Write a protein that binds this ligand. Structure first.
Ligand code: HEM
Ligand code: HEM
Ligand SMILES: C[C@H](O)[C@H](O)[C@H]1CNc2nc(N)[nH]c(=O)c2N1
Ligand SMILES: C[C@H](O)[C@H](O)[C@H]1CNc2nc(N)[nH]c(=O)c2N1
Ligand SMILES: CCS/C(N)=N\c1ccccc1
Ligand SMILES: CCS/C(N)=N\c1ccccc1
Ligand SMILES: [Zn+2]
Lengths: 407, 410
């Protein structure tokens, strides 16, 4: 059934058919919508494999070719024998790019095809993983001129020899629960910060301490590693009009690299597949800095701005929030570290969405996640109806490693 | 069955059972979510179960479920339906129903006030002039000199669908929009189509930037009639900034009473096509949407320009910066004229408390995240971090086709 999506700001109506190819379930039903809920075998493997291969070959205009047919048979036999199979470089690359292309929560998918894929499937040790990771970080940071990339470690076999990167992101700050009962650093990592200490890491107990990597190879226990400080590009945060801003003592890293998700291609699962792009300003300025559960810096900034924090109606939080995000973007731009603001990113997503509709016949999108956490209605995506649904290859959530590892 | 909902800022988890009473569709399937889609007579056989459901609810609320009064009411209604095909609600049932349609509106962030609603029974009204008098009284009562009071006026329910009472305006009070041959628009762009219909019907448009539109009223299915709301009844607020003396020179102002008049009210199968209802504004509705939406007044550039902001590149956040001041100004003004209004921080915080309270005494609170989260500063308000469950419950307020596209002119 054809589904239509209207943008109420421009009246443009796009038609969606791509959803017909949906596989998984949204979590919603005809009776209840869960759009705002954060997270709602051989016989199993060959169908998924076939689906993927058909996708791959149709994309290269060789749907049905002997090549297509040959490969299909090849995988089938392989699965019957090895109870699994291995992707060819080309299919790996394609799968990775398409997992991104299909990430309904990502606002920067316009860059989907421009992804550097690093095949780390020959890795065997945590030291090896560290090596692959370091090179990834260096290639991606590229001295401020960031470049999207993903490193793919060995795919899952029996689940007991799973490769995993225990960090949620390759680069994140430590979080410690102090005497006061308060939290020093990033509250979002307090637990992990502990496990690292509980492993041997010597925590510096600072506001912005870069955590160590906890790499797991072949189901073995995780080992710690320190990313070469020279490889971790960081930006000090200063305001374009408030010279006192520098006194807040804030900084953030330039490389956002997700490392706790699972990449699924043709039924195959890769539990260790760190991938990175570049920051949208609000991510740091609004969420990391102002989220109550995070660095929660609104109070301070408000104080230093000397404004009435007596009544919410003064919108002093909104006032502060803005300047702070002015300072994030400013700092990044000044040090020449790639960064995008919510206005450009959202506008770019609209264009991308428009291309995806005429080239794909659709674009899965999660409105709740796409709309920036600030100035929602003044960005285009706020007025854009979206259709959310799951498509593979895909990136998926997965249980925290420490919550399931057999030490 | 049970459904857990979590708030990622407090880790508070709530259990929902109320959704088990959801009947109507949501537009979503198991393979697709249409959460961001704006908007995805009855026969006697379909009518009684609806009446029964409602009455069982009503009676259970007054703690008289199964009583004789309850049993006889069902008997009386069933008989009435079989002989007249419809049925008349008792004043108590009408009041109960109206409050619950509000209570069940998942897109409303101000439901904490749901129980405090003044219901005006206009079911004896028979003409447009009659509707005009009723509407003037609703406006006067609700405005209350700036100290707003929630209210709803209910006109005759639908019969054969050929004699509907309808208020053609989307809101009782709204500004006219005029499209110039220039291609530009004067006034509110969102009311252009309706403005035209009024002019065509005989309205003498002042052709200004803030002209209060006339009421177009349709009684008993007859052609609509024009009426001007008494000016002294229309409370308006001039918008000025607490620190920007030039703000007042922007020539901005807005009316104080938001009163929806194009929605349909459903109570026990009965349909009330004309049920204007009003409450009070949350600051962002005027300051963010009415003033800054590109397709509305669109005053961001003029405010930014006068604020002397670097408008060379979006990354300077001039739009965001100016948006906050514009919203600063709306709140300040309304407060200076003692006209009720609530900011998005207070409104959303109250909603959270209301929500939790609804889970503990009702077993849930249907809520549409996309509409509940404010159009600005989203994540610095608690609703952003709050998982919500959206499902439909009756009584309810529904959208309905524009009268001008269905009406059979006489
Ligand atoms: C090139 C620049 C990129 C930008 C500006 C961008 C921006 C964003 C933003 C703002 C979010 C929300 C993050 C959050 O709230 O936690 C997001 C989500 C997402 N992005 Fe992108 N993205 C980019 C690159 C990537 C890449 C390279 C991939 C994968 C190859 C990707 C995969 C995802 C996924 C899976 C999500 C959702 C994660 C989740 O569900 O928690 N993104 N992106
Ligand atoms: C007491 C003050 C009230 C406040 C602050 C409040 C606030 C709001 C706001 C901000 C919206 C979104 C409006 C938009 O974006 O267009 C909304 C939606 C809604 N409200 Fe309330 N409300 C109040 C009273 C009422 C009353 C009295 C009723 C019903 C009796 C009501 C019924 C609804 C409905 C039906 C919607 C959704 C409208 C739609 O779907 O288009 N509200 N309210
Ligand atoms: C409860 C709600 O789902 C939650 O707060 C979501 C809303 N939208 C979001 N959007 C983005 N981009 N990132 C997030 O972490 C969230 N959190
Ligand atoms: C397309 C999207 O559903 C649309 O822009 C919605 C989003 N949330 C909203 N929320 C409120 N309160 N009011 C609106 O008009 C909208 N518009
Ligand atoms: C791949 C980093 S792309 C980015 N800007 N941010 C994200 C942060 C957390 C999860 C997903 C995306
Ligand atoms: C009933 C006025 S209550 C209010 N604040 N605003 C609304 C505006 C449009 C639709 C619904 C509510
Ligand atoms: Zn849904």
């Amino acid at each position: 059934r054809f589904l239509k999506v209207k943008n109420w700001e421009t009246d443009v109506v796009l038609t969606d058919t791509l959803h017909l190819k949906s596989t998984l379930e949204t979590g919603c039903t005809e009776h209840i919508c869960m759009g705002s809920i954060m997270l709602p075998t051989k016989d199993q493997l060959f169908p998924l494999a076939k689906e993927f291969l058909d996708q791959y070959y149709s994309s290269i205009k060789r749907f049905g070719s002997k090549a297509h047919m040959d490969r299909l048979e090849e995988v089938n036999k392989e699965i019957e024998s090895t109870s699994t199979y291995q992707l060819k470089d080309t299919e790996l690359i394609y799968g990775a790019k398409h997992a991104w292309r299909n990430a309904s929560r990502c606002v920067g998918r316009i860059q989907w095809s421009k992804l550097q894929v690093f095949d780390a499937r020959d890795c065997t040790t945590a030291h090896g993983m560290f090596n692959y990771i370091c090179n990834h970080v260096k290639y991606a940071t590229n001295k401020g001129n960031l470049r999207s990339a993903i490193t793919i470690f060995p795919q899952r076999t029996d689940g007991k020899h799973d490769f995993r990167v225990w960090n949620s992101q390759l680069i994140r700050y430590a979080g410690y629960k102090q005497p006061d009962g308060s939290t020093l650093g990033d509250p979002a990592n307090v637990q992990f910060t502990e496990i690292c200490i509980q492993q041997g890491w010597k925590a510096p107990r600072g506001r912005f301490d870069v955590l160590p990597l906890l790499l797991q190879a072949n189901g073995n226990d995780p080992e710690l590693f320190q990313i070469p400080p020279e490889l971790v590009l960081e930006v000090p945060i200063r305001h374009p009009k408030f010279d006192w801003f520098k006194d807040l003592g804030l900084k953030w890293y330039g490389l956002p690299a997700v490392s706790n998700m699972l990449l699924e291609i043709g039924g195959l699962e890769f539990s260790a597949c760190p991938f990175s792009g570049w920051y949208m300003g609000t991510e740091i300025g609004v969420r990391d800095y102002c989220d109550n559960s995070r660095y929660n810096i609104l109070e301070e900034v408000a104080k230093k701005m000397d404004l009435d924090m007596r009544k919410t109606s003064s919108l002093w939080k909104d006032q502060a929030l803005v300047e702070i995000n002015i300072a994030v973007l400013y700092s990044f731009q000044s040090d020449k570290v790639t960064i995008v603001d919510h206005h450009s990113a959202t506008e770019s997503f609209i264009k991308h969405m428009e291309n995806e509709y005429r080239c794909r016949g659709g674009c899965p999108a999660d409105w709740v996640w796409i709309v920036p956490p600030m100035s929602g209605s003044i960005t285009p995506v706020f007025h854009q109806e979206m259709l959310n649904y799951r498509l593979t290859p895909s990136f998926e959530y997965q249980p925290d490693p420490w919550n399931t590892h057999v030490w």
